[PDB]
Design a protein around this nucleic acid. Sequence first.
DNA 1: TTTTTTTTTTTTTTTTTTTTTTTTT
DNA 2: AAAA
Lengths: 139, 517, 517, 139
Amino acid sequence: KSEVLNTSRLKEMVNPGDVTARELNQKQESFQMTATMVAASNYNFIIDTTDHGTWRRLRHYRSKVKFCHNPDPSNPYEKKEDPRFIHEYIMDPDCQNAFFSILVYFWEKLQKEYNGQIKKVFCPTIESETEAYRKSQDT
Amino acid sequence: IAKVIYAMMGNKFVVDVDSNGKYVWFEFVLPGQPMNQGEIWKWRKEVNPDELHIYISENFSRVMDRITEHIKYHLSQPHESNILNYYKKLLKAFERSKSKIFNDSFKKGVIRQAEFLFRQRSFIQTLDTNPHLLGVGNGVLSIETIPAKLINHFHEHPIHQYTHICYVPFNPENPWTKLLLNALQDIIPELDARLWIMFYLSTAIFRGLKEALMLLWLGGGCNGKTFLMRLVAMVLGDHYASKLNISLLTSCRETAEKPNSAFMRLKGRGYGYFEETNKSEVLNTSRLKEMVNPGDVTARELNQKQESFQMTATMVAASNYNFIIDTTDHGTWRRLRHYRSKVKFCHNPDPSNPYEKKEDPRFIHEYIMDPDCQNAFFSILVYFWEKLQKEYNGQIKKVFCPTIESETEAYRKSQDTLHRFITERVVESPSAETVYNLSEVVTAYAEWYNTNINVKRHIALELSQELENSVLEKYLQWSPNKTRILKGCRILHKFETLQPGICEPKNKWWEWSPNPS
Amino acid sequence: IAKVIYAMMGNKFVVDVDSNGKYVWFEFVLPGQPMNQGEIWKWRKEVNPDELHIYISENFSRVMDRITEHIKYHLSQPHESNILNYYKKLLKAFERSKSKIFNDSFKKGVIRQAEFLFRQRSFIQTLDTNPHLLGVGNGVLSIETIPAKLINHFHEHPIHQYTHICYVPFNPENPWTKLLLNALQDIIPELDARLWIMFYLSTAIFRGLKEALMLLWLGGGCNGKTFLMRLVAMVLGDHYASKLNISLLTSCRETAEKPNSAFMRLKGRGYGYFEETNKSEVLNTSRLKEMVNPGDVTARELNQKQESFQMTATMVAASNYNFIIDTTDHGTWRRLRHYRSKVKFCHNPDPSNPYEKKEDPRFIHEYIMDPDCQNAFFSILVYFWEKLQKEYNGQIKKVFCPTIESETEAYRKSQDTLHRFITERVVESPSAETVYNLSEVVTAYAEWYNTNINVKRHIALELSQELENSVLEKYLQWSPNKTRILKGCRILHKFETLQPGICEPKNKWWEWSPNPS
Amino acid sequence: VLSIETIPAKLINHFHEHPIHQYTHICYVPFNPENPWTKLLLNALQDIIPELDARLWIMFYLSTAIFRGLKEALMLLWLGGGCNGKTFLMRLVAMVLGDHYASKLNISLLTSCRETAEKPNSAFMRLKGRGYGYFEETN
DNA sequence: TTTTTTTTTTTTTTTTTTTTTTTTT
DNA sequence: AAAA
Ligand SMILES: Nc1ncnc2c1ncn2[C@@H]1O[C@H](COP(=O)(O)OP(=O)(O)OP(O)(O)=S)[C@@H](O)[C@H]1O
Ligand SMILES: Nc1ncnc2c1ncn2[C@@H]1O[C@H](COP(=O)(O)OP(=O)(O)OP(O)(O)=S)[C@@H](O)[C@H]1O
Ligand SMILES: Nc1ncnc2c1ncn2[C@@H]1O[C@H](COP(=O)(O)OP(=O)(O)OP(O)(O)=S)[C@@H](O)[C@H]1O
Ligand SMILES: [Mg+2]
Ligand SMILES: [Mg+2]
Ligand SMILES: [Mg+2]
């Protein structure tokens, strides 16, 4: 369901800096994280803060397609599921090869255009959906 | 010597490095050698190659004597000063080396050296990967093609796990098979439900990817569900079937990350069953969807590091108490199935109780100890899986059964506290309006099922939208301050008042009948 | 050398690999050698074959001497130039090899080499598996056929565990047997109950699958329960009996924490007992029915992995505090039997108290360390087991005893909080209408026994169906809003105002009397 | 080694065959009331407990501490106040008997209020072979 | 209830081996 | 000087 969270080890992983913590059964060595984070859910996240910096390093979106097994013409923002589309199509290595090619091509496009600055690109939906969250989530 | 031995008996031994970095020897079993029951025509794990140790001391001696004989024969023929000293020195050195093969330190060194020669890269991780091969007492059974082929001869399949249940082709004429079929028909009266449940159970033989379906059905207190669960688990074997904790799904409790030996279960297993519950159990997403979907999952080796094991076993949960489900998502209530039994065995069965019969006290205490019973059950399961493959091509969701998915949807119409409150307290009484942002309604609903159903921590936002996920939002506009105030209801308390506002099989049912069945 | 040794005395030793992957040595004990008490005619576990080391260093010497005579005897007879050098060289080589056996490094390698020759596959897991064989002080006891036969000579039974109680044929004329029979009869005045209890205790000697039955009996505060409980365990031995903690059966709800050692009892133990409790306590748990049933169970013990073992033992729970039973499962009630003691030994026994006698201070403090007491008592139990097999063919449920199952069913009519409340506030006062939905009846029933009986987490199921599982459903309808509103009755919390609306044996009882008895 | 098998007790200071290994470092001598220490202890002991019958009964109970076999189930607890000298008597016996046969256990154990689940417990141990257990004051 | 006990080591080679120079062929 |  919906989850409540605020700065609870949030900014420590948000920033590209360095943190450190328990290492299984040891003390620590170092944590230089470089991985992109994504958190998709069907329940609204509860945030209770007004820090400008936290909202600065945040993005929000909301998809509008909810496929149905009985899709009528009156439902434009949904279609028919393919049960095998998730159950299979991942086992075929050719699918991963094609997806990897797509990812490499898109990364090269990003490097060519905005030179590695993800925030340099402009998307009307992006930020707008994020500031919409800012407009919300404020008791 | 290691090279000679590898060239000599090298097709029978395989050495591979374990997960801990220790070399392990595997032996290929053949008839006519000391062995455990049911371990024929397939590989086994060996601590040290003992029979290789006796082999290097027994069989190599004949080759040694052949070399000695050849040397002596060459010495016999007339020659020149070469046989004066060279042949004699070779004979002396070879004689001194002959006894070396018997030395224990020498033998250990030879074995350690030949570990590298017998090394075969990429062997452990490809063990039991084929799901169409199942280990059996009389060899290996292949279900890749219909009909399934029993292999009792030489092969090259990487099969090591097994069960000690000998396999025979499905023979309905067997007395034990007929008795089991009749008993199974009696336990579940409906033909269509019987067939559907048997087809679902036959999927436990397979070990590959399967459709994400969960079976959970109710039954009588003395129904006999646990008999079927224990029988299936016994027939499949420990390596493929294991008894998981019913509460596990009901209560996620500690995270999988937290040391869990049950998390090390479901790895390679083909069966996991839930025991009877002492009472009704509530569960929702408490490691539910993780066990539901067939995707690969991690593997927390108790206190050790975090592995990843693929899960494919069939999960079944049987109880005499219902289970509390608190959710509305269609996806969760689309990979579940429900059924209810109707047989409550009695030791004084009057004619006025057709939906029950006399117990057999020895039906559970014994009748599992007979190996013939497991053979018959295994044949039945194999035959049913073959029938499913023939008809629906492995698609369990494709088979139709009217009584099933009807009890399931009936259960879906139940186990919904929100609808009870709706068509108990507000519906049929819309002729008023008292709503404080539905917050009063949320609190009333919460306290209502706190005493009515159960007490638990609440979140205001869960009903902030679930109210619109009902028939309540038929009249809900909002004030200038929004507040989404409902436009009609009546908060009712106490008594108040009503204020204005299938076909029976002919002789055989295992024959499945034609496609309509 | 190892080949010669195995061909010479190889039948006396067996080498098998343990579960941990370490070779283990087993020696068969024969009379005429040192041994621990009660370890005759059966296999024993030995870390190092010490008797073998002295055997290869002493007994093997004479075989060496026979070689020494043979070579010189052939040397004595005149021959050609072969005896000039051949016999001389071999004799020098052999005498050099003579002293090699007395070396230590040489002997270590011999033992390691002989581990392959003496290896016997599938030997540990088939040890102590036959339930009809019991290790006794004077050999091994077989209860396969009536009468039970004691084997005290050579055999091939794979038996390793034992108890140190020497067996003698049952003699009722023995003074210890006479005293034990008299005291035991006085302990339980009822003949039929005495017959029923002894038969149940007789199954403890068995080590195979048994009828699922739980014994618990009540009575006097100082009856003498622990005397009989201690005697059976002491006689039947530690290897087959264990002290079981009551907290395991009375754990709150959790199945097990990640390690568990107490539950790993009953692995080979054929008997476990439960003692007096601090106070009346509830025991309705998962283990209430999970442990009692003959189905196999699995658990983990710390470093030991999470394996399974068949529960094979008889459970008895004697106390003076009545156990709080709260369930409606007829299956659970099947496993349980109840009895009440009626003897309270007193230090001032007057004739006006026939249901008691004088204590014997030395009855428990001593009379146990005497081996003859154990031998006589064990004979009594063994005789009973043969007798029970003769009459009821080893079926404990089919034995008849009028006083048992009568006090038990009277106990069943108790420990029913709901039924007690039924004829307390609503029944006998049905002429009113003050019954809302079942939630209010849940609350009303909850608050009653909250102080009258105990506090408990009142979940919905306690009356969501028990209303139909009662006598109050005769008038149970639902409104247009459903709600299952009862037709109503005088709830009337509290009770204010009125409510409107055997045969004594002649001289011997172990003779059991004829079949009716 | 001191033998209490037969009356009177006999001391073995020569060769024998009894498998005994544990001991205490207190030398044994025949009981002589004429020793100044024997009189000194007896006088103080007599003053500690005034009643003759109680004095006899208590010390007869404590005399069983030498024995190491099975004993009748008797629990002795008694009340005092202030500097009553109770600690003196328990402490004297413990060292006299020695650690191999006497030991001190947590007073909480006596309370029995604490309950132990499936978990290691050490204070329950140490009672093997001993013949004397003494406690102290509580909160 | 982790917690710390449990785990998990943790000795792991070591001796030896060979030679051994002398001896005695 | 080479083999034990
Ligand atoms: N086909 C059958 N013919 C004869 N007896 C049967 C048959 N099927 C079941 N029984 C008996 O009826 C009972 C089966 O129901 P139960 O086993 O009591 O129900 P359950 O689901 O197994 O829960 P349990 O076993 O009570 S914990 C057993 O006593 C069986 O021996
Ligand atoms: N048949 C008998 N003849 C003589 N004395 C007996 C007999 N049976 C029991 N006693 C004695 O009477 C007492 C038996 O009752 P209790 O021992 O007080 O009750 P209990 O169930 O044994 O509880 P505990 O464990 O002994 S405190 C013991 O002192 C026995 O020695
Ligand atoms: N028999 C005795 N002869 C001489 N002095 C004694 C004797 N018994 C007790 N005392 C004195 O009284 C004191 C003993 O009392 P305490 O040991 O203080 O009290 P307790 O009851 O043993 O427990 P504490 O120590 O007060 S918590 C010592 O300081 C002794 O000097
Ligand atoms: Mg059952
Ligand atoms: Mg007792
Ligand atoms: Mg003091």
